[PDB]
């Protein structure tokens, strides 16, 4: 459950990501693939080489979805309904993988915004991502 405080923290931190969102997206993914190789089983037809256009392109879509999430913090389920449907009915990505991407994103953000990634913002992002994860797998069964 996102508190009022959490919502301000997420809006603020995401505000600082700004134009770099797509880039951080591509980097979180790349970090995910290296630290947790089992995640690669969902991208069998991807060129996963460092710098691939495919990973950059995917990184940008993930980032845009998150941006949309940040804008509708009071209606995550409505804002991400199409994506829940997609993950639930087509992609069928095992729920554990969401924690691996969340962590990778957290790692990315921390390295890029050292000064803004305070304990409180860290806690709020962690909760936001968990809530995004939950929404995305809510239609699985």
């Amino acid at each position: 459950v996102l508190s009022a405080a959490d919502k301000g923290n997420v809006k603020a931190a995401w505000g600082k990501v700004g134009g770099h969102a797509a880039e951080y997206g591509a980097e979180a993914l790349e970090r995910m693939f290296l630290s947790f190789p089992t995640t690669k089983t969902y991208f069998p037809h991807f060129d996963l080489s460092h710098g691939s256009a495919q990973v950059k392109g995917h990184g940008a879509k993930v980032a845009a979805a998150l941006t949309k999430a940040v804008e509708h913090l009071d209606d995550l389920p409505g804002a991400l309904s199409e994506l829940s449907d997609l993950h639930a009915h087509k992609l069928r990505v095992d729920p554990v993988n969401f924690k691996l991407l969340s962590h990778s994103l957290l790692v990315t953000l921390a390295s890029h915004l050292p000064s803004d990634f305070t304990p409180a913002v860290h806690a709020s992002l962690d909760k936001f991502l968990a809530n995004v994860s939950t929404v995305l797998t809510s239609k699985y069964r």
Binding site: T38, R92, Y140, R141
Partner: protein, 145 residues
């Protein structure tokens, strides 16, 4: 990971399992309880309902196949890694099967053993199998890269 005693207890119990029947049930329950697992068995046909899945002749055939392999593992409790190394590789490189699935199936299989053996599938027995299922899932996931 298992003690000589746990091995002995598990080996002795394993010799009562009707592998074909249990295998089809385990795979079937996995597709019903965790429907996203259906992603790898599109070619099997109709999986729309609990009934379609349970009676699906391919699910059943595949269930047995997996369970025979499992049984093979039971004969090599001392080297699960060596026994499943090639299968590990195959599941990674050709099948692209998320190793997490191995964990789900191990758990469904302990539930199926319980349902089939009732009171004979004791708390201690179950504990031993929890270890087995875990060691197998781990041997199968060990060559992912």
């Amino acid at each position: 990971m298992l003690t000589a005693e746990e091995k002995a207890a598990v080996t002795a119990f394993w010799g009562k399992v009707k592998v074909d029947e249990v295998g089809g049930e385990a795979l079937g329950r996995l597709l019903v309880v965790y429907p996203w697992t259906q992603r790898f068995f599109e070619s099997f046909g109709d999986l729309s309902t609990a009934d379609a899945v349970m009676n699906n002749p391919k699910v059943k055939a595949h269930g047995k196949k997996v369970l025979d392999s499992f049984s093979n593992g039971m004969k090599h409790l001392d080297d699960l890694k060596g026994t499943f190394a090639a299968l590990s590789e195959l599941h990674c490189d050709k099948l692209h099967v998320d190793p997490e699935n191995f964990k789900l199936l191990g758990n469904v299989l302990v539930v199926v053993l319980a349902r089939n053996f009732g009171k004979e599938f004791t708390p201690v027995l179950q504990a031993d199998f929890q270890k087995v299922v875990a060691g197998v899932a781990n041997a199968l996931a060990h060559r992912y890269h």
